[PDB]
Amino acid sequence: EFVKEHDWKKCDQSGFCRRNRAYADHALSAISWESPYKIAPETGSFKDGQYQAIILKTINDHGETVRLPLTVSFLESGTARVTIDEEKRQKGEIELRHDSKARKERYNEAEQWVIVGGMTLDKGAKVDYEDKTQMTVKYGPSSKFEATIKFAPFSIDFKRDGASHIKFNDQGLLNIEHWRPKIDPPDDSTWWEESFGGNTDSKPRGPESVGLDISFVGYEHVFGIPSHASPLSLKQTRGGEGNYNEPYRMYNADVFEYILDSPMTLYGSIPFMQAHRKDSSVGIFWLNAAETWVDITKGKDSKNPLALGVKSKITTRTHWFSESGLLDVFVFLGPTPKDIISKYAELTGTTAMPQEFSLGYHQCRWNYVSDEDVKDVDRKMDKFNMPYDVIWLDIEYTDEKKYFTWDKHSFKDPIGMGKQLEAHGRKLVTIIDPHIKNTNNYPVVDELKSKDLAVKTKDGSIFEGWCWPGSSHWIDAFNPAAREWWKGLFKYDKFKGTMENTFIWNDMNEPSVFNGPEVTMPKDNLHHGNWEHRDVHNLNGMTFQNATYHALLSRKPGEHRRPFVLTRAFFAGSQRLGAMWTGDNTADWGYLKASIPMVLSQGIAGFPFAGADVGGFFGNPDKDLLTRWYQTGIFYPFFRAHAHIDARRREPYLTGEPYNTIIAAALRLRYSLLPSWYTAFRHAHLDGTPIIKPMFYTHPSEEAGLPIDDQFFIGNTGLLAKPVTDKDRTSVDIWIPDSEVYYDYFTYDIISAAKSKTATLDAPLEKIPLLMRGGHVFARRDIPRRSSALMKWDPYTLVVVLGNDRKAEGDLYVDDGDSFDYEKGQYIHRRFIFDANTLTSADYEGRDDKEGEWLKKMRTVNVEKIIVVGAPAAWKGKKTVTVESEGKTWAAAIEYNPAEKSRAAFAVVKKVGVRVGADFKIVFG
Ligand SMILES: [Cl-]
Ligand SMILES: [Cl-]
Numbered sequence: 001e002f003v004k005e006h007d008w009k010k011c012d013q014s015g016f017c018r019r020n021r022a023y024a025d026h027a028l029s030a031i032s033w034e035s036p037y038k039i040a041p042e043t044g045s046f047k048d049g050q051y052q053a054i055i056l057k058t059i060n061d062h063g064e065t066v067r068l069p070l071t072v073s074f075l076e077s078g079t080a081r082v083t084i085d086e087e088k089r090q091k092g093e094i095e096l097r098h099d100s101k102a103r104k105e106r107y108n109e110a111e112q113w114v115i116v117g118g119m120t121l122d123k124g125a126k127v128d129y130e131d132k133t134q135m136t137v138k139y140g141p142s143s144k145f146e147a148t149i150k151f152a153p154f155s156i157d158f159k160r161d162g163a164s165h166i167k168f169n170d171q172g173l174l175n176i177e178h179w180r181p182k183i184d185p186p187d188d189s190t191w192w193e194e195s196f197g198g199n200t201d202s203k204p205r206g207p208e209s210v211g212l213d214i215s216f217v218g219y220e221h222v223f224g225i226p227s228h229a230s231p232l233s234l235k236q237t238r239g240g241e242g243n244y245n246e247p248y249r250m251y252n253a254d255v256f257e258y259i260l261d262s263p264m265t266l267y268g269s270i271p272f273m274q275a276h277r278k279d280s281s282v283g284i285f286w287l288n289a290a291e292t293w294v295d296i297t298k299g300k301d302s303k304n305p306l307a308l309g310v311k312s313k314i315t316t317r318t319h320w321f322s323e324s325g326l327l328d329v330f331v332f333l334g335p336t337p338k339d340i341i342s343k344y345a346e347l348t349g350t351t352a353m354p355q356e357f358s359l360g361y362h363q364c365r366w367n368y369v370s371d372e373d374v375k376d377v378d379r380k381m382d383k384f385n386m387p388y389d390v391i392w393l394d395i396e397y398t399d400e401k402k403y404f405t406w407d408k409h410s411f412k413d414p415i416g417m418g419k420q421l422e423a424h425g426r427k428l429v430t431i432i433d434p435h436i437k438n439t440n441n442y443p444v445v446d447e448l449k450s451k452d453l454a455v456k457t458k459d460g461s462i463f464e465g466w467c468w469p470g471s472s473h474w475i476d477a478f479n480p481a482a483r484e485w486w487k488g489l490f491k492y493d494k495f496k497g498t499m500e501n502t503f504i505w506n507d508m509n510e511p512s513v514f515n516g517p518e519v520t521m522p523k524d525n526l527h528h529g530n531w532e533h534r535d536v537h538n539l540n541g542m543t544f545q546n547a548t549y550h551a552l553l554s555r556k557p558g559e560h561r562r563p564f565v566l567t568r569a570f571f572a573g574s575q576r577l578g579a580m581w582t583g584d585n586t587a588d589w590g591y592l593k594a595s596i597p598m599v600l601s602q603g604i605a606g607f608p609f610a611g612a613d614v615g616g617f618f619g620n621p622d623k624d625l626l627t628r629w630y631q632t633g634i635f636y637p638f639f640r641a642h643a644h645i646d647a648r649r650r651e652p653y654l655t656g657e658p659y660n661t662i663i664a665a666a667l668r669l670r671y672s673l674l675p676s677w678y679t680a681f682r683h684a685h686l687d688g689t690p691i692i693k694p695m696f697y698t699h700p701s702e703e704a705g706l707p708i709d710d711q712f713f714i715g716n717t718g719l720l721a722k723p724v725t726d727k728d729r730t731s732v733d734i735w736i737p738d739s740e741v742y743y744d745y746f747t748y749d750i751i752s753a754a755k756s757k758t759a760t761l762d763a764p765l766e767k768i769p770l771l772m773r774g775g776h777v778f779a780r781r782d783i784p785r786r787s788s789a790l791m792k793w794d795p796y797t798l799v800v801v802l803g804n805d806r807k808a809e810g811d812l813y814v815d816d817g818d819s820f821d822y823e824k825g826q827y828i829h830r831r832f833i834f835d836a837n838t839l840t841s842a843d844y845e846g847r848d849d850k851e852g853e854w855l856k857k858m859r860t861v862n863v864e865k866i867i868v869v870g871a872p873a874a875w876k877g878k879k880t881v882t883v884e885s886e887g888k889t890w891a892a893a894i895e896y897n898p899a900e901k902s903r904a905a906f907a908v909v910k911k912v913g914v915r916v917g918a919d920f921k922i923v924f925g
Contacts, residue, residue: 002514015190016209020321035172039151049121074125078140100204107325107535118346173213197517211321219275232709247293254512268570281334345688349576356817360389362640367396384653401469414497425789437469453482458524477543479528541569587616593725597709603690611636634670680715682813718776774803777810795864802870871907885920
């Protein structure tokens with residue numbers, strides 16, 4: 001590695017963070033503090049779902065003002081948007097220092113990058129009341145939501161169900177740093193040039209941060225703003241036992257040996273926060289791409305939040321501030337977690353339909369050293385009956401760190417290697433990063449430069465800095481021209497050695513710059529549009545993943561298929577583009593434990609296709625740690641083992657017995673559940689539903705679930721997992737959320753019924769703690785195969801899990817896994833309902849029964865086995881069920897097994913013989 005001992009700005013070393021914390025400190029200390037911002041009421045108009053007005057900020061004691069245009073939008077979804085800009089900058093009436101050509105206006109293209117829907121204004125929104133001091137707009141479903149805009153001082157309260165839920169500027173922390181010239185007087189130490197990390201930011205605009213206090217009234221838990229090594233329920237940041245002392249930071253960065261339990265930034269940022277309490281949820285999305293900090297405090301609503309004499313109800317106070325751009329905030333009023341995340345996904349995108357194979361097990365390290373190493377690992381996985389889908393090539397596969405090349409010594413036959421993988425339906429993933437080596441005899445860099453596709457410096461020169469290849473330039477993927485050029489580099493006939501099973505890993509896209517400040521670009525670099533790097537930093541990774549995504553749609557004439565791209569850096573909207581992982585984690589138990597809250601936070605922030613490196617990246621995991629890590633990793637939506645260059649080889653067959661057998665059983669469970677995992681991804685695509693779901697999401701009425709972040713439900717299955725993540729543990733305590741019956745997935749032991757509680761479950765090394773909730777049906781594939789592609793035509797097993805209602809529902813989505821034919825209806829989506837002794841299968845969307853090639857071939861694929869857990873006693877002695885499908889009726893044998901000790905009664909129907917694409921009805925009893 002280049003950097004050994006890294007320097008990260010603490011809040012006090014970030015000028016605009018210092019200024020905004022100081023602004024908060026002053027406002028909280030001041031007596032009868034009034035925000036110096038007022039709506040000029042005569043400038044206001046409401047029409048057709050939108051309020052527009054001028055906020056006047058008073059900027060000195062003479063009462064001089066600047067004009068800050070306000071726009072409040074009320075969207076058909078019931079979401080609201082509040083935007084504040086700065087008129088002098090809209091007009092261009094400022095002067096940038098240093099003869100800079102940077103844009104004068106406040107960055108206003110975050111919307112262009114992030115927002116894909118949800119923007120229709122609600123012409124049903126209406127002013128309920130309006131005088132010279134305030135106005136209330138009714139909006140949302142049946143006009144149930146209200147926003148009360150107070151003019152002087154400016155504030156907005158967002159209300160429903162007879163209460164305020166979210167307040168803007170209640171504490172008076174609104175801060176829009178208006179443009180000023182650099183003048184010596186007739187505290188400005190952070191206003192202009194700032195130095196850190198071996199770099200001086202020329203700061204041509206001076207101060208321009210935007211900040212606001214957002215209060216969540218009556219909420220004691222807030223969630224989101226990934227990525228951090230931190231609990232799902234976010235910590236306070238202004239001190240106290242078990243709290244942080246610095247704000248959560250979002251400034252995508254390459255953080256060497258990142259630590260646990262910290263508000264420090266990691267590699268990606270999604271500035272979306274939710275607040276949840278029993279039966280009420282709200283949220284905000286802060287649409288800003290610049291460095292952003294969020295302070296969080298909790299206490300009573302009184303100015304001294306520890307005062308006596310006041311009601312105890314807790315308000316969570318949050319203080320958001322970004323270096324530049326618009327103040328631009330979306331407000332979600334729920335009332336459930338599912339509602340909020342759905343509405344957020346309508347705005348920023350749902351999860352892309354994945355390549356099916358990408359849900360399988362990925363095998364990676366730094367590095368497989370040759371094409372022969374790759375082919376050998378492939379063979380050994382099969383020798384050891386460990387299924388996997390993809391083998392990965394880290395940076396040593398390239399010729400001297402030039403992307404779009406292969407090391408000729410070590411990778412002489414990449415097509416041969418590809419074809420070997422293709423023999424089991426397996427894939428290859430190759431790393432490609434945004435740093436393009438600055439060297440002679442390299443057409444990729446020649447074109448990057450001559451076509452003006454590289455990121456620029458403060459004076460418009462091509463930026464140069466160091467990364468893996470040494471001296472490099474960076475693709476400016478903000479430029480559509482750069483994205484279009486990038487597409488051309490990936491065609492199979494151009495990127496020699498690649499073929500139809502080759503997909504792509506994007507890394508170091510924060511961007512990582514080894515000699516740059518905080519290992520990234522200078523803030524005064526310039527991008528396409530003449531935006532400063534400060535304006536757009538948190539978007540950078542996403543623009544690069546975007547470029548690569550679009551490059552993989554078609555790589556030869558007539559091809560049109562789903563990309564698979566892994567990214568390190570990301571933003572709101574990256575869910576449209578592929579997977580993420582949590583970067584360079586460490587081979588230790590605390591990082592295994594921490595992975596679960598991190599991966600959960602990803603999904604509730606609308607980017608669920610997420611995982612952590614299995615085994616941990618840095619170091620050498622003990623055999624038990626590695627084994628437990630597989631048992632956790634099979635529940636990551638993105639499931640990959642990876643290891644640092646100095647770490648011992650740890651392909652899973654190297655572990656030794658008994659670990660090999662336990663790891664193989666974990667892999668087989670992941671594969672068996674693939675039908676249900678894929679269906680979970682379908683729901684993420686349809687409406688932004690998380691793939692693995694925390695308790696707050698599934699059980700919004702159960703208050704005790706709010707701080708729980710070590711257990712989760714899988715998709716739409718009712719499967720409740722709590723992996724073991726502690727050394728030498730041989731049992732686990734699972735929180736049972738409700739009064740439903742819960743069954744051990746493996747033994748059908750009844751773990752709980754009738755009442756929410758904590759249950760202790762035996763959990764030796766060989767146990768994966770996994771429960772099945774009553775009321776659910778899920779599909780699996782029992783026949784073990786070497787890869788997901790080799791399962792494609794195999795029969796399904798349905799597991800029907802009954803509680804006392806003897807009623808259940810679930811679903812199964814299947815398609816060709818690769819094309820966009822799903823857009824034209826070429827898929828199977830079954831809704832399974834058990835009710836009144838009958839299991840039925842119907843099309844999920846109610847479509848009437850034109851079959852393409854894939855649908856036709858699926859006519860050979862059946863449901864063959866049904867297992868009913870919690871089978872009623874009345875079925876005892878009955879030797880058949882009656883099956884009806886496609887006009888034919890027949891008996892199928894059923895085996896009834898009575899309850900025994902704590903094991904549930906269960907019944908098994910074998911050789912059901914019904915095609916999965918057809919309606920059916922099966923009557924029991
Ligand atoms: Cl002005
Ligand atoms: Cl749910």
